[PDB]
Amino acid sequence: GSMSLLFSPYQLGSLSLANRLVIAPMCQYSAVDGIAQDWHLMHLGRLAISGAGLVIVEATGVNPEGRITPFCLGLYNDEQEAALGRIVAFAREFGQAKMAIQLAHAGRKASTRRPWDPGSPYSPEEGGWQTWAPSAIKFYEESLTPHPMSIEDLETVKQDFVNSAIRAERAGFKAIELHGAHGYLIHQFLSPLSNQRQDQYGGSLENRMRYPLEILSAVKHALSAEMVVGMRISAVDWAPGGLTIEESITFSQECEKRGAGFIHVSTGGLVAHQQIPVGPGYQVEHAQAIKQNVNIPTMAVGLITHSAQAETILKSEQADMIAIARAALKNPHWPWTAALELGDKPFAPPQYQRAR
Amino acid sequence: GSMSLLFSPYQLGSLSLANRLVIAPMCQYSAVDGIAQDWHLMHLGRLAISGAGLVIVEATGVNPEGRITPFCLGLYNDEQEAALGRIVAFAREFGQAKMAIQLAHAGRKASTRRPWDPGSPYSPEEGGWQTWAPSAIKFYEESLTPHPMSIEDLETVKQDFVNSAIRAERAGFKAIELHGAHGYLIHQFLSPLSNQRQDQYGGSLENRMRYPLEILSAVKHALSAEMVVGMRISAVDWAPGGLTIEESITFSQECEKRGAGFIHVSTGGLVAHQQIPVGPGYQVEHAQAIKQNVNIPTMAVGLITHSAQAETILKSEQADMIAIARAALKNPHWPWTAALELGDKPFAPPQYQRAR
Amino acid sequence: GSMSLLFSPYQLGSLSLANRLVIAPMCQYSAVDGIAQDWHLMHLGRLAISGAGLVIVEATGVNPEGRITPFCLGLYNDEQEAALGRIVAFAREFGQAKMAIQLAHAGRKASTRRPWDPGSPYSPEEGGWQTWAPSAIKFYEESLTPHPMSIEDLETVKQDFVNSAIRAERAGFKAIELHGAHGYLIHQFLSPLSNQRQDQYGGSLENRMRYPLEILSAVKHALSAEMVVGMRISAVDWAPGGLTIEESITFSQECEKRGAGFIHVSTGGLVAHQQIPVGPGYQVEHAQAIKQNVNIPTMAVGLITHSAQAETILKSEQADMIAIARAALKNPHWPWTAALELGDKPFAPPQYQRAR
Amino acid sequence: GSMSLLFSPYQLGSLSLANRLVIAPMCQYSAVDGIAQDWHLMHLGRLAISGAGLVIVEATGVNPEGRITPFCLGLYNDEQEAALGRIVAFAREFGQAKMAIQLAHAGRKASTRRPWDPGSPYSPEEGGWQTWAPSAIKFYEESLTPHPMSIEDLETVKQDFVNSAIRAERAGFKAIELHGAHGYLIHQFLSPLSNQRQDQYGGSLENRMRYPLEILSAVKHALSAEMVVGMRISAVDWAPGGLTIEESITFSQECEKRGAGFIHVSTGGLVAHQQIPVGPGYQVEHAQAIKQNVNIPTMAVGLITHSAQAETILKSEQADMIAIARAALKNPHWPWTAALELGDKPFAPPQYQRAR
Ligand SMILES: Cc1cc2nc3c(=O)[nH]c(=O)nc-3n(C[C@H](O)[C@H](O)[C@H](O)COP(=O)(O)O)c2cc1C
Ligand SMILES: Cc1cc2nc3c(=O)[nH]c(=O)nc-3n(C[C@H](O)[C@H](O)[C@H](O)COP(=O)(O)O)c2cc1C
Ligand SMILES: Cc1cc2nc3c(=O)[nH]c(=O)nc-3n(C[C@H](O)[C@H](O)[C@H](O)COP(=O)(O)O)c2cc1C
Ligand SMILES: Cc1cc2nc3c(=O)[nH]c(=O)nc-3n(C[C@H](O)[C@H](O)[C@H](O)COP(=O)(O)O)c2cc1C
Ligand SMILES: CCC(CO)(CO)CO
Ligand SMILES: CCC(CO)(CO)CO
Ligand SMILES: [Cl-]
Ligand SMILES: [Cl-]
Ligand SMILES: [Cl-]
Ligand SMILES: [Cl-]
Ligand SMILES: [Cl-]
Ligand SMILES: [Y+3]
Ligand SMILES: [Y+3]
Ligand SMILES: [Y+3]
Ligand SMILES: [Y+3]
Ligand SMILES: [Y+3]
Ligand SMILES: [Y+3]
Ligand SMILES: [Y+3]
């Protein structure tokens, strides 16, 4: 690349990327017992040949109770690892995208239904399960009060993150994103609205960061040095008394000190009474606040739908990388059109080059 | 549908379609021994969820020597049939498209390379094969002169079409398109530039139509009556002394009498010295000529790239159905954008409805 | 031009046009006593530099009572002629469009309000006037029954058309379009729903065509031979018992025999109880019916909004020229984008070439 | 407006604007003796009905020698004022834009040719004139060395700015933009590359700002209090030893103290050996630097071509208003399309509402 920043090659730690465009993680709710299915090969295989330099696989539960739904991906046994490795192998052969995976634990937001099947969370008798959380504070008022995690629970989930990370590297993923955003377990520890613990893992900012930073360090220590481990954050909670940009800056700096390779900057998701001023680029200001206070790449996301918008965000130095989600659902070849509009050569596998 | 013709439900014989939009067949050159691969599940699965009412699988050889390349799909053994049936099953579960397959024999254009691997056709020592044709007339001057087919050769290929058709119906395909276009075997019989036979299968128009009409009747007789069997034609050869629109009208009328369910109207492909006046809708006039002389649905194709162009073709009654190929490679969700521009509700699988 | 038909130079009679794109006439309702104002210089000057090869000025009344509204253009005195000549001179200096004007008489549809001021027609005491028509049959039930025109009335209006044509030629217009469409005076004579006369100007088709053909012949005879005089028609009435495409074909053939230079093919407008199947290219079929039966250029119009749609209409030979109206109101530089989409050089005046 | 910031009503000093979209000044080189012509009515009248809330008329010379070219607008006599007043009156009748004018003196860049007539500046005997500048330093090496301005020259040109401002207010303009950018006279004083004076108007930053700040204060004092007077700046020179963003921040703050109503942030234009990193939004970072240090509205400009890009600039608080130029030449109804893409009601005069 030469004409635009968006499609110029970029170095993410030890990982050489074809460009600065990222496909954000998007849950598909199409797995069986956490095992990726034909849908994921069709869905992720398309994103891998889209032209983006990095594709982040949807939130993947580190243990059965960490899945958002009974239909989410998991990475806690050999059968799930083999299915994901097959998809990574397809991406290696046909696309120019590096494959990353988002390791997650849904915390108090687990055991829920597909978004297109509205209703209350699955009760244990309906095939659901009781959730875990830093504190016994509910997100869904209609379901069971979450189990407050003991010190041994913290070590169990942390080891599950480590084991899922080791499986991911073995399956061929070149980067890992820890899901500390959108109201799931790590975010639940970070924010005072959900963390009311009275030990050293709740209260002050340093206490609320303590367990998420342990997970990051433990994951980084269990992987080879060339593996990239990043953190997706919710920089603010959009609710009174929640996470502030100053605290998220501090957390992002602490993540960098422990070897995080990038910060993926999102917002919201912690409480139902949030008020989010949704609009084009409504989270770009938060990405710029993070980028100006860390020395690792920052990914912006949120209603980024046009190449000229994406390139301005990079050129004006609001972020280092552009992530898109819904624009890629509408047009999975968004990078093709975007590269042409910016004057760069679009990527296309040989099978598709008669349309180029 | 209610706002446009393009996205109003349509009946193709006994086959109820969600709309009048067709994805034209597009060779992928990604098979192994004729067996569909992961690429085809990714490629065809996406087209099946695109919103189109009908997806026509790429040209599939009825026997090993009928493949265009060593990397084309085949439908002459159980392993190939099972792999295609798996893709059809994916379409039945997630998409609203009916699945069709184009049964083909490449004739004198067989045993060639991938289009992105330029070079001469594969010689027999390179893993290629000598081709079959109605007459010993070469398309590629650098390769072997094709073997002119005897009467028993005609019956062998005809039975191969029948067997592939039976396999296709068993694999779940609801429609079959016989490939009588683009310079392959059936087209080679139809045109005087390639058919110089001295028996009852060459010479007059009725002789040149005789063998293609036999294949159609044999295929239609070997399948259940609710199966749709259509014919893709090259209405003209774009070369002096070749097929004329009057002859293609006659052949299309003869196809209807034999039970053909639709006519898919393309042009060209027979000889290398063709001069094609390519441009937006350059084959639509040929589709209107066929439509005005037959009582079965006519599909138009050829540089149809915009919804307003497609809808005008239907409203002005130049054709009954719209086929797209390259526009679907560039944007596999073309029907999504097209439906919105025409004021109709776009189709999207539930996994993607948060982008709708 | 060389890449598309739409932007290839075209010969309209003795007029050499830059392309085949026409801006259809569009009433602006912004005149004072029929005199063009600053609005018309802003509006028509923009259309003249748009890139279209031909701009047709809105329906211009040949006498005060022939105006649709008190705010319509007129061409029956020196002050109106001078104002229009100033606009034609602006077009000559900056644009590549030839200037045409639509000469009209509203007949029984005259003396009405601006479309954005809904209400009954202006009564004579409100500043309106009683209308003239072939028969005493109302379009608006709330207004005065129109005067049925006597023999001297026919001669008077015909002479008004002649005088306006002479003024138009003197002001610099290179083509004239007679408004025989959309339910106005000439159309009122053509259709049996509005013409119930008992003399030689009503009854048979030959009688209903008689007065419109006299106007055409008289206009053609009064102008220099290189002036182009065309006819805009309503090919059908979209009402039971109205004009048929067969009758409009005959009238269009009679127009050519009198020296008409083109047929502009529209539909509707005669009666309020019409049912029009509106949609993209819904009048293109009617244009093709006329084009196949005359040897003068045919202009298609009606929801033509995209370059690929326009080029398909020309390439498939449904019409000889493409007319647009509402697409040019939405984007007055529609030809700029259209030429780029078709691969041709877009026209731009030197003041705007830093955007090219 | 309510759905987007770009099309929400905005307060610019005492001026109520329909939205936050600005049409940037664009020289047309179509005047005669500084008098606006039919071209300017066509061009500026279209911009006034485009939907933008503010239209800035092209750089207008405060005296004959301050014009960039012999074909630029001037505002130093009654005939020029009356012609501009007739355009403002057209805008007031049909559009929703408030009208502003850019008052300028080209300094050492005066007496040049139309951009589409490349060549050396007009010499005095060819109808050109010798230029004035803070120092006898040439921009064009082929022309006469500019006159270094004496104390009376400063007072004379300052009075010319005052007189033109009074004429502009009398002609109906509601805002004035002083042209302190793009290498013209005021910019020539600000930058050390062009200002080498040894008196109190050169040397230190305080000295280089002294004369531009006098012009602003004198213009502000001669107008009514409700008139808006802004400053267009070149925030950096893109050349070694030129203006820095720190210096432009200081100048912008000094402008605010003396009553400037807004800062319009551009860059470059001072020296020919500049190297500008052109790209989408390449001047937005400079606008944000100004916005973060002043309490008056800041306008961003420079390759802003898409609504999502423009809205992101506002929502992420890089600027308060969006200015477009070349995008408005390509599509003068850019605000119409932009409002629809952002979900707001587009503005259209009643004559055009049948296209909405
Ligand atoms: C269908 C869907 C699934 C998503 N799943 C995830 C997820 O698993 N993990 C995550 O961090 N974000 C998820 N998100 C949020 C996106 O990653 C992204 O942050 C959000 O959609 C805003 O970006 P966009 O406007 O480009 O879509 C999902 C979004 C959608 C629409
Ligand atoms: C990559 C590619 C593969 C194709 N393979 C086939 C094929 O197997 N059988 C066939 O009948 N046409 C084939 N075609 C031709 C298309 O079906 C279609 O008729 C042609 O591309 C014109 O349509 P379009 O302009 O919409 O692309 C292929 C076209 C492309 C671009
Ligand atoms: C505002 C407006 C004014 C029009 N005025 C005229 C007219 O004066 N004479 C005429 O023959 N048609 C007139 N028409 C009809 C158009 O010329 C054209 O035939 C019709 O709008 C369909 O074309 P389109 O879909 O491209 O707009 C007008 C249409 C509009 C929207
Ligand atoms: C034809 C043309 C004329 C221009 N004239 C002026 C001018 O008179 N005064 C000025 O400050 N900028 C002028 N400019 C610069 C623009 O105002 C604007 O700052 C620049 O084009 C970048 O914005 P854009 O990318 O939206 O076009 C002109 C630009 C163009 C293309
Ligand atoms: C036939 C009467 C009339 C024509 O409209 C005479 O010119 C009235 O203006
Ligand atoms: C200083 C002389 C001059 C510069 O503009 C002003 O009078 C000449 O017009
Ligand atoms: Cl293990
Ligand atoms: Cl999520
Ligand atoms: Cl083919
Ligand atoms: Cl009309
Ligand atoms: Cl300038
Ligand atoms: Y323990
Ligand atoms: Y920087
Ligand atoms: Y019909
Ligand atoms: Y009379
Ligand atoms: Y022809
Ligand atoms: Y002096
Ligand atoms: Y703020």
Numbering used by the authors:
A (entry chain D), B (entry chain C), C (entry chain A), D (entry chain B): -1 to 354
Paper quotes:
Old Yellow Enzymes (OYEs) are a broad family of flavoproteins with a modified TIM‐Barrel fold, adapted for the binding of the 5′‐phosphate of the FMN. These enzymes catalyze the reduction of a broad range of unsaturated carbonyl and nitrocompounds, creating stereocenters with high degrees of stereoselectivity. The reaction occurs through a ping‐pong mechanism, with a reductive and an oxidative half‐reaction. In 2017, Scholtissek et al. isolated a new OYE from the acidophilic iron oxidizer Ferrovum sp. JA12. This enzyme (FOYE), belonging to Class II OYEs, was thoroughly characterized, and despite coming from a mesophilic bacterium, it displayed an unusual thermal stability.
FOYE exhibits a tetrameric quaternary structure in the crystal with four molecules in the asymmetric unit. The electron density for the FMN is clearly visible in all the protomers, indicating good retention of the cofactor throughout the purification process. Since the reservoir solution contained a mix of lanthanides, we decided to place yttrium ions (depicted in cyan) at these positions. The four protomers are virtually identical, and, as for the other tetrameric OYEs, FOYE can be considered as a dimer of functional dimers (AB and CD, depicted in orange and lilac, respectively). Using the topological map of Yqjm as a reference, the tetramerization interface arises from the barrel helixes H6 and H7 and part of the loop L6. A small distortion of the helix H7 reduces the distance from the respective counterpart of the other protomer, allowing the formation of a π–π stacking interaction between the histidine residues H304 and a hydrogen bond between S314 and Q316. Notably, FOYE has a unique Q286–Q286 interchain hydrogen bond; in the other enzymes, these residues correspond to E270 and R300, which are in the range to form a salt bridge; however, in the crystal structures of TOYE and GkOYE, they appear with alternative conformations or form intramolecular salt‐bridges. The enzyme displays the signature C‐terminal α‐helix at the dimerization interface, which bears the typical arginine finger (R352) forming part of the other protomer's active site pocket. Moreover, as in the other Class II members, the threonine residue that interacts with the N5 and O4 of the FMN in Class I OYEs is substituted by a cysteine residue (C25 in Figure 4a). Differently from the other tetrameric OYEs, FOYE displays an extended unstructured region in loop L3 (residues 102–149), which is instead found in the other Class II enzymes, although with no homogenous length.
